[PDB]
């Protein structure tokens, strides 16, 4: 499955415009995700102790995790699919240490696309979250084949 060049930078355009606030865009993402599907919260200890949206929007923590999050996304979208190197140490210590499962990378993709289309309808049309959701469903393709090389069915 892949992405066209037009495809490329219609992800990358709308990626250039989380890159003026990833801080912002990060705890929206992880609040959508937490209160959407609140089993991804409760189940990793870093965040468990987080009752309502408010104490997630004054954790600095929670505002770390996000930004340490895109960046790591934002690399990865960037090689345009040359993204082995940068995928070996994400799935290792994702299946190995505190196990996410695919079925939780389908819920943060699900945020994502949720916040770039609250907050991006100048760079997110149809055709752009087309693009986004092919990018994201590559990343989730090649973990999970991480993930089965690795020990873990994911």
């Known amino acids: 499955m892949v992405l066209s060049e037009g495809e490329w930078q219609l992800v990358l355009h709308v990626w250039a415009k989380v890159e003026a606030d990833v801080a912002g865009h990060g705890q929206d993402i992880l609040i959508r995700l937490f209160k959407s599907h609140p089993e991804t919260l409760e189940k ?7 009752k309502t949206e408010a104490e997630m929007k004054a954790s600095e923590d929670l505002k770390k995790g996000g930004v340490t999050a895109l960046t790591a996304l934002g690399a990865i979208l960037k090689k345009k699919g040359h993204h082995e190197a940068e995928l070996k140490p994400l799935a290792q210590s994702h299946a190995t240490k505190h196990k996410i499962p695919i079925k939780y990378l389908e819920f943060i993709s699900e945020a994502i696309i949720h916040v770039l289309h609250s907050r991006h309808p100048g760079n ?3 055709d752009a979250q087309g693009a986004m959701n092919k990018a994201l469903e590559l990343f989730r393709k090649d973990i ?3 993930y089965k090389e690795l020990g873990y069915q994911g």
């Open 44 to 50: 990793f200890d870093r965040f468990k102790h987080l």
């Open 124 to 126: 997110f049309g149809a």
């Open 144 to 146: 999970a084949a991480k």
